Amino acid sequence: KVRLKELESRLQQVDGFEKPKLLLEQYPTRPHIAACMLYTIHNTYDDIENKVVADLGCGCGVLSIGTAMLGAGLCVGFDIDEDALEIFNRNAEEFELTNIDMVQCDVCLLSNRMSKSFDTVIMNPPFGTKNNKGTDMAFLKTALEMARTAVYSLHKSSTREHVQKKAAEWKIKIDIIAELRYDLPASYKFHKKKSVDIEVDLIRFSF
Amino acid sequence: MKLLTHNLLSSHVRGVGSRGFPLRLQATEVRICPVEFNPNFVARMIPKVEWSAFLEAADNLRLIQVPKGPVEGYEENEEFLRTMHHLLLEVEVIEGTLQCPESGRMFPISRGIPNMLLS
Numbered sequence: 498k499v500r501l502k503e504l505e506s507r508l509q510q511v512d513g514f515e516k517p518k519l520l521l522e523q524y525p526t527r528p529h530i531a532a533c534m535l536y537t538i539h540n541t542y543d544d545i546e547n548k549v550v551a552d553l554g555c556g557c558g559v560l561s562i563g564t565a566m567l568g569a570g571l572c573v574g575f576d577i578d579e580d581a582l583e584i585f586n587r588n589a590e591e592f593e594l595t596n597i598d599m600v601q602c603d604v605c606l607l608s609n610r611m612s613k614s615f616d617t618v619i620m621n622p623p624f625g626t627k628n629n630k631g632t633d634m635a636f637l638k639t640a641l642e643m644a645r646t647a648v649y650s651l652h653k654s655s656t657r658e659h660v661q662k663k664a665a666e667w668k669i670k671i672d673i674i675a676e677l678r679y680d681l682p683a684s685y686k687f688h689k690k691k692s693v694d695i696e697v698d699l700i701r702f703s704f
Numbered sequence: 705m706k707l708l709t710h711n712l713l714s715s716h717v718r719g720v721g722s723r724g725f726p727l728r729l730q731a732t733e734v735r736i737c738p739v740e741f742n743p744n745f746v747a748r749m750i751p752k753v754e755w756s757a758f759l760e761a762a763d764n765l766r767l768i769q770v771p772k773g774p775v776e777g778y779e780e781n782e783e784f785l786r787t788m789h790h791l792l793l794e795v796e797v798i799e800g801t802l803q804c805p806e807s808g809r810m811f812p813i814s815r816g817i818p819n820m821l822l823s
């Protein structure tokens with residue numbers, strides 16, 4: 498049994514990006530965010546232990562590392578950037594976690610790939626506009642195609658109504674399980690009154 | 705890349721439409737990596753494995769005596785679950801290729817990571 502503070506402590510030991518790529522919105526999932534999110538997924542919903550899990554936009558691996566310590570049978574991380582994945586591999590090896598794999602790919606181009614191959618999908622996606630919609634919405638479409646049971650994701654709280662509308666169109670059950678805030682990299686604050694932090698919803702999608 | 709991961713990457717839901725095809729695996733470098741045995745997980749995975757694709761991949765990695773399908777009583781067969789644990793999770797492709805059946809293009813596996821981009 499891993500307690501919440503213990504989990505968060507461990508996730509503080511995950512090393513981040515060596516030269517984060519701004520265009521890909523590279524920042525590690527923040528330890529308190531990841532710990533509360535994964536602890537809920539495991540202890541409230543039982544959506545990790547003995548499951549096969551996908552982490553979309555896995556980065557340096559914070560969410561996957563935590564998932565692997567909570568009893569997953571296998572967590573597979575997916576990211577477009579090889580440099581992120583090199584770091585993730587290093588982190589997994591440091592933690593001695595061998596119930597992990599990772600794959601380099603573009604999550605927005607996974608139509609009909611790994612359909613219903615995972616129990617659970619978890620993600621902290623990018624938000625940038627990609628073909629008229631948030632990249633997070635492209636990630637969501639992929640996640641729902643890949644997942645059998647549940648998707649857990651962080652979306653801007655400012656987009657809540659849009660997410661709710663798409664879930665209804667898709668006949669997906671949606672539950673907003675927490676309202677969270679965390680700091681973006683300082684370099685993201687490019688106009689005077691832009692907040693340093695971002696308000697997100699942790700959302701559980703299910704079928 | 706583990707063989708369970710190859711199986712998921714390669715998978716298609718079988719239905720009324722035509723058969724999909726797996727990625728053909730070749731390897732130049734393999735390593736054995738112990739994973740803590742989770743018999744509950746392995747038993748859950750048995751009915752989800754696409755067995756023809758698993759057998760092809762295992763043969764290409766020079767694995768031997770590979771179970772040819774799910775055995776009688778397999779949730780109670782600790783030996784079969786232990787064997788499948790090893791073959792699905794502990795045999796890692798480090799350097800290799802995945803070949804797309806519809807194009808013939810090679811997608812490289814390097815440092816254990818498949819690169820599925822169309823570079």
Ligand SMILES: *CCC(=O)N1C[C@@H]2[C@H](C1)[C@@H](c1cccc(Cl)c1)C[C@H]2Oc1ccc(NC(C)=O)cc1
Nearest residue numbers: 600602603606607610713804805806820821822823
């Ligand atoms: C038969 C295999 C094949 O056609 N592809 C196209 C790539 C990749 C392999 C697909 C895929 C299959 C199974 C698992 C995964 Cl993780 C991925 C998806 C498809 O993805 C891409 C990614 C990038 C591009 N473009 C560029 C410019 O790189 C196209 C397609």
Ligand SMILES: C[S@@+](CC[C@H](N)C(=O)[O-])C[C@H]1O[C@@H](n2cnc3c(N)ncnc32)[C@H](O)[C@@H]1O
Nearest residue numbers: 521525526554555556557558559576577603604
């Ligand atoms: C906020 S970071 C995710 C944080 C991650 N959970 C971690 O702990 O490092 C967003 C990630 O999405 C990846 N990414 C961006 N666009 C992508 C795409 N189209 N497909 C896959 N990964 C993508 C980035 O490279 C980056 O690692």
